[PDB]
Amino acid sequence: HQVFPSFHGADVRKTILSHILESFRRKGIDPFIDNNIERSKSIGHELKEAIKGSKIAIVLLSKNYASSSWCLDELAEIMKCRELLGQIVMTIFYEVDPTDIKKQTGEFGKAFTKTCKGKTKEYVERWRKALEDVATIAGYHSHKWRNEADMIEKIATDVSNMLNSFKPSRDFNGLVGMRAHMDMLEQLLRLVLDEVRMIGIWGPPGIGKTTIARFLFNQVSDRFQLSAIMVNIKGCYPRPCFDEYSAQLQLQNQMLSQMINHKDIMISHLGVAQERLRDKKVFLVLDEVDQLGQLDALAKETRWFGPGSRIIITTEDLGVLKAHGINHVYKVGYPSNDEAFQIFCMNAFGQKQPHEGFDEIAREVMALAGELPLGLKVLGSALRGKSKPEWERTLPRLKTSLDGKIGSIIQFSYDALCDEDKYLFLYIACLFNKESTTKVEGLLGKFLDVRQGLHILAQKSLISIEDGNIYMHTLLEQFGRETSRKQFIHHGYTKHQLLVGERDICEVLNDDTIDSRRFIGINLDLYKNVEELNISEKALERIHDFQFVRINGKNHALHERLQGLIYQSPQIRSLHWKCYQNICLPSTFNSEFLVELDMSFSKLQKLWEGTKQLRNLKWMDLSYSSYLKELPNLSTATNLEELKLRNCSSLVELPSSIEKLTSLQILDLHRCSSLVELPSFGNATKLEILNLENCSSLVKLPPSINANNLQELSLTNCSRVVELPAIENATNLWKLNLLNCSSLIELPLSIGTATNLKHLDFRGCSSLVKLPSSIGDMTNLEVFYLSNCSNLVELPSSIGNLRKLTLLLMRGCSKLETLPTNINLKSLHTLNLIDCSRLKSFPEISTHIKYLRLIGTAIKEVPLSIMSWSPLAHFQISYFESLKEFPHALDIITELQLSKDIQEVPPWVKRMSRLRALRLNNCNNLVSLPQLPDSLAYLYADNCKSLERLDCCFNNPEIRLYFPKCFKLNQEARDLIMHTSTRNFAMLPGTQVPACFNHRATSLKIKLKESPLPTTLTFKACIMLVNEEMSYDLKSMSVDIVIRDEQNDLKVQCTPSYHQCTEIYVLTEHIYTFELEVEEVTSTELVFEFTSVNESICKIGECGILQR
Amino acid sequence: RIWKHQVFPSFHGADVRKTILSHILESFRRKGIDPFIDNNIERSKSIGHELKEAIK
Amino acid sequence: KSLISIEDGNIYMHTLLEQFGRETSRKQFIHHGYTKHQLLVGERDICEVLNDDTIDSRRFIGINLDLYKNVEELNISEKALERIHDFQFVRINGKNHALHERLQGLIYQSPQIRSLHWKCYQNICLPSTFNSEFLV
Amino acid sequence: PSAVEALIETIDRHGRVSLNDEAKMKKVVRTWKKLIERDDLIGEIGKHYFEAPGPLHDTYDEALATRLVTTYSDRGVARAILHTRPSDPLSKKAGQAHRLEEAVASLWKGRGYTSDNVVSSIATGHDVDFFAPTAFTFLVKCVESEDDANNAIFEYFGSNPSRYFSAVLHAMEKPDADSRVLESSKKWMFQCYAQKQFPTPVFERTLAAYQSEDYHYEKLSLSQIEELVEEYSRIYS
């Protein structure tokens, strides 16, 4: 129904009720209908059901309303529903005083009394309570109204108003990702502060600032005394605004009228808003604020609003927010790609958040739309209703030009810029979309005041500077490229245009409406194969110049007429090529003006074939140009800053003139596989980043660097390097690594001058004899890796000076013999001396070591000072026989490794307590495993021959019993290994699941039924592996478990839902066992599914399990 | 320090609602004052409870 | 958009709609790439613009002439004959017995002519100086 | 909470809940980006998991590499490395990314993965993906030698030169394809057959034999066959 009417038919069904029915009918209101034949003495259940679902009721009261038990019961039910449910009750006092209804008096009271005779007490009580309550509520007194028809019309209008507000924002909940915005905005709000905090919202046009504001106002405004939302302030403002004060006054007037719902009153002066709102909770939303005038109009001071209030202004340039001093700003971010697809499919496939039918062109169109919700919506609306071929035929036109819907909105923001800002926008859109800001300033610095332009554009959110490079959204870039055809660029007054088009420039070049001067920038993308070179012969005779060339050549085919066309230009500024596909550079190419030159893939050999002059050049990038033998004379290149010969691989040598590159800062010869030497650099070079990663043939190096500012110096492989250049001050060595730089001899003493080098590696630095004595000079040195650094027979005693290094990994240093002794390192976490085959004397630096690893050493002694060291989390020693005379060592041990051959079975291990692990490498001649101590968590036998008996029932904890290759195991020992209760794996040599596991099978499925009523059940699982080429060294396995029913589909839980080990051997003929707990009690319904993560490594073969 | 109304008048309706209250209310609107007016109480609400809320 | 109608592979534009289109030709330019062009559509009154001799005539890629008026030769300045025009689309309905030496010299000097319609040519041979490499 | 505090809480949660294969295959990428976002996180967290209880490691990176590989799918870690390679090699982010991938490469070596094991993990189903530089280079580290890397990818194609060449020719049409390296793979096939001293027409048929339908990739074309026949023709006569 719509409305439930309650009335007394004998009084009003004829005269007034008909008029109200007619008014409701004409206003589109359908009240519940009833008949006098449809009434009993009682009301009935269906009548109450109709009342309950009416969601609004109108009680029309007359003189004899109380004279019907039917009507009184209806009123009682109405009040009951009002109090319990959210039913809204309207009253009409048809010529009866509300006080008479309240006290049950007058003729109404007489009728009520006459009706009340005979009824039980509770009926009378409910009737009286309902009558009092209905008399209290605010309705319509017929006596007050001078005009009955006007009163009825007012009642109908109020009913209609209080009927189109039930469902709050039921529609348009199909907007995606608003929860992220709400959460990110709640932190800014902090409504708990009871302050008057201002909040801004800004971002590129078309992200959802308006929609986010609307959603927030819809969600929060109910918590505020007085809330209003102003929409599109920028649009509704006088563009010339001859009287700023009048427009300011009318803006504040609109704000107040919509604020108090105060019927568009007129306002005297500009301070009224403070007078009214300085004492009330206010939630205000100001949308699309363009300039500080509107802010001064609407919210100029914090003190304008009552204690506790929030005002939120959505803008587009940060400068307006900053001028008003807000500092509580949410930079709205783009939605996630999945949310982008959801929005696009919502707008393109009609409420389908996923696609329909095809799901292929949808993602192409989406990627075309960038990420703007505006772009996604426009494209989705454009494409909806079509079919796949229609999509395909519309796609190219959509790709080559953007819709006017996006274009107009972008154009409006573009027109609010200064002329130089527009020029910089065009420059970025056409040529420098993703380039470092410094290079942009260097190339455009004499035209546009690049720094200020970039600052303004970033403030306007027409560009973003992520890291050190600028980025413009692709949707905005397309607008820029389009406008580049219908607009010009001026510097003083010279007119310029930028040529940007995939092979659609060639027609413009074949013209006679020509100037040889209009075009300064070319951005060409040539991915596809050429049909014919569309340039005409006559245009090749032109002498037109370009100050910016950027060509993305992408094929093996060579362009000749294009080359001849470009190089006629007398003064190029920056040159970019990819896949140059030519042997040299043409001799007719002038380079006196050349600031940046990059040819990131080339076939250039000995370019320039002779010396030239390079006055203002600042960036050379010949990366990946593999077919490059040598490099031109770099004399008179003094202003060069960075040189990136990244992975040239055939650069036999470097020019001798490198000495004169005084301004050089970055030198990257990463692979550069053909190098032999590296000539001296000079005196004032001050190289900042020196990278030579894999120069396998590099032999010689400069004797000195002058490395006053050398952040990073990397020589990773550099296998044949005899000496090393000295260093001056090294005050900023952020990074120095020599990983595997074998064939070294020494280390320059100046290395200790690096006061801030926190981390340091020499792993693999074989043939290094001794460390320099100045190492102790280093400070903040935290990590010191040495691995298999054989022939390092020393360790300097100045190490005690370090006092900060946490770990000192020194592994495989087979010839290290001694360590410095009278040293205490105040904070030394670990000391990893493994396989130091000649260490021969216990490493005693009396410290706070927590992880000591001494395995494969030859110490055979343990000092008595160790009780000074209270905590050790890991002390690991390789077992030698004469440990038994060192009782101080036993209680402070953690691990142990029996040797290749130990016949004896050491009972002493029972006394020694902390045995977190015990390892048995080889030991083919071992009679049996020793009785395990109470603290045992790990047992390993990587290879073994005879282990007939394991005489120990050990039940410490989650213990791992790994037996990779030991077959002479007695049946009882084997059973003990399977039937021991643990929480980790246990792995045996076996060729078949043991019969102990009844329920067998071979993404595999295991089916069994359980014999129990209701309990938590425990299971033991046994798994073999699919016979594959398992690596003998394979050491990693993880297993996932899924348990499910078939009578039902209840995916049950499983407490150890996974078992993982990073050290278990993976081999074919072996048995892996573990344990499970299940608790859900779907009785006769158990189906198991064990999967091996990393199916590329291990796959589960046979399987069989057992219950307990 | 938050009030929804500035002035709440209390009176007897049968005596002064027509004659003098009318002039006082009219005078207040001409001085930028927003007094509470009981005639503007939303329909379908309990006057007894609602009126007490406006007092505080 | 219901601005044209395709009946049997031929497009049809309503008379009033076409008439509106013709007027806007003078007041609007056509941009294809970075260049700019306009069209010349007139019975006989749009020929003095060829005698303007003060504006770039490169932006004239289409001619639509209807010469069912008089056998008199149309008046063009001798200097306009000097300029060479890049006319790509030509539609001349030269309905008379007259021969237009001036028009022939003006048009067949175009370097590249994309399509050429000439009803009632009223001559003997196409002039030798007529390049036809581009002729669809 | 700080970045570290949050990032630890996230990694533990993902390794705890054992969620969907694709959900892991996506969430690993987001975690990877948060790692290389700023330089002083890999070492700091790598220091945290080092001190935490568990198996011991030789370095902080191994401690972090083990945690990441265990948490997400190991086959998934491979995808995150391939899809999060920044542009500028000398930037801070590229430095962080190299630390991550090298640790994973060393982690795989210590577990004794074969050449085939790495390739099967790298595999994405599109046979040209293996020759993308962001994938081929990471393969080389895991195997130390291009010949083995080429051999591993050759055998992953079931020793099918036709399927092999279809991939390498399709890698010649990439915007960032390294010709010198791709040539080495293309070259590498030749001396394997030159070691066979196969006749040129037999070599044609040997290549043409797999061109039949004995085996879901894109087959070659007869014209480029002849050039490949011509290419091998004179070099190793």
Ligand SMILES: Nc1ncnc2c1ncn2[C@@H]1O[C@H](COP(=O)(O)OP(=O)(O)OP(=O)(O)O)[C@@H](O)[C@H]1O
């Ligand atoms: N629920 C109601 N709906 C409509 N009108 C009502 C209602 N209750 C009372 N009235 C009207 O109020 C009038 C009586 O007003 P009264 O003199 O009691 O005002 P008051 O109680 O003095 O106001 P205040 O308490 O604000 O000073 C009656 O004539 C009646 O028409």
Ligand SMILES: Nc1ncnc2c1ncn2[C@@H]1O[C@H](COP(=O)(O)OP(=O)(O)O)[C@@H](O)[C@H]1O
């Ligand atoms: N999270 C979202 N879900 C669905 N649609 C959205 C979302 N955000 C924005 N849109 C749509 O994208 C369009 C962008 O408009 P909007 O960005 O709100 O204007 P403005 O740029 O002035 O803030 C809106 O029409 C809106 O319907």
